[PDB]
Structure formats: structure tokens, C-alpha cells
Amino acid sequence: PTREDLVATAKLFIAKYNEFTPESIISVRTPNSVSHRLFPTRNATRNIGESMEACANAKEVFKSLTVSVIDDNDTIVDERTRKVVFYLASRGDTIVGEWKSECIFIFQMSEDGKLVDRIWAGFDTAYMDEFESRLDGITF
Template sequence: MTSLAETQKRTALAFLDGYNEFTVEGLLRVRTEDCVHVSLPASMGRPDRNNEEYAMFFHQLERVLKNFKMTTLKILNDPDQHMAVAHAKGDGETPVGAYKNEYVFFFYFTEDGTKVRRVEEFVDTAFNAGLLPKLSEYMASKAAEAQR
């Protein structure tokens, strides 16, 4: 019989591997139907997203992020609290340069550990502050070109 700790760790790894699949289905596979995805730090001003909202956000991301690879660096797991923390990095390519982000995910699991009911994701704010304005400018120029 698999222990709760092993199940939670497998679920956390499956969550992160969903980014390597880079599909909405892969990203939502181990989330509960009412899962909430919180983007941190709050100073970035990103809203909390349910699965439908996260899927819409991801569709925007997949237009500009290619060859994405999520690498799990470490996972700390607490089965008594039905939580785990993962440190990961993501690498990919965008039309405006290399994508190299770093993450810390807090996972809150269901009682049996097979689903994530809440995820809190910290991102590298310095990296995002440099990349996001360039990506926004690129996307605006593409939209303007499409209107011509």
C-alpha cells in the first residue's frame, strides 16, 4: 500500500510534469474541480484563478512560450498537514528572448493526496519585471499587424 507521503509527492511531481506536457489538460489533470491557483508575491498584482481562468491564462502563455521545460529541484512534503513545497525552474524561448524563471509552489492536497485543491506559486519577480513589458509590447505589435 502506498503511503500518503508517497501519494502526495507523486501528485506534486505530476502537477509539475503537467508544465512539461504544456497542455491545459496536463496542467489541470491533478487539480480538483474547485482548485484555486494563487500567484505570488501579491505585489505583482496577479489575480487568483480557478481552473477555467487558469486555462485562459495558459492559452495566452502558450502563444509566446515555446520549448518549455520545468525542472523540479526539490520537494518538501508534510503529509500530516496535506501540504508540500516544491522549488523548480522553468526554461523556454519567447519571441523577445530566453525564458528562465524560478518558482516555489505550495501545494494543498485533498485528504487522500491524489489532487491539488490549492496551489500558491511564487515567481521570480526580477525576471518577470524584465520580460513582461517586452512580451506585452511584442503582443501589441502583433495585434496591430493583424488589424492592418
């Protein structure tokens, strides 16, 4: 797969991610793919089934959620390891107020370049902690 092939798959992943349904967030992934969350305070690993479960749980909190590659000039592509790095803006509305953050996604594509075989995601963990404290403070 060419540099452009790898980026196109990563951009398709993002397109389907922004549909934000359990069906759509798996639709550009290999079935044995795992999704890693970077940094010790938020470290986690999710297979396809756990990813769909996480998406459905997020949908209980997020009324909407969109991510966008901020600048294609930031994008990093390693043709030899079939990896693409995006730096993304994430934006949404939730039951505890606005979500606004940025994150780094690393994709490793399948051998044919057409699917995401592994994901690593680096979030703003302090922001996640603040958001969780808003969730943890729900009262009626």
C-alpha cells in the same frame, strides 16, 4: 496519504504541467481548485477555467516551457496539512527571447492525496517585470 503519496501527486502535476496544454495543466487538479500567485506586485488567483485561459494565452508567447524540481532534498512535505513545497527551475523559448528563472510551488492535496486542491506560486517578480517589458515593447 503517506509522505510518498503526496510527493507523487506533486510530481504528476509537474509531469502534466510540462505537457503545457490547457487539458494537461488541469489534469491533476480538483475542479474547484484555485491557483494563487504570491507577492503583492504579482498577486492573482485563478480557477480551473481561468487557468486554461492563462495557459492558452501563455502558449501565444512561449514556444516551449519546462519546469523541473532542482533537488528532491529541497522538497518540504507536511503530512498533516497535505502540503508539498517544490523549488523549481523554469526554462523556455518565447517570441521575445529566452525564459530562464526559478520559482517555488506549494501544493495542498485533496483529502485522498491524489489531486492538487490548492496551489501557491512564488515567482521572481523582477524577472517577470523584465519579461513583460519585452512583451510590452513588441513592434513590427
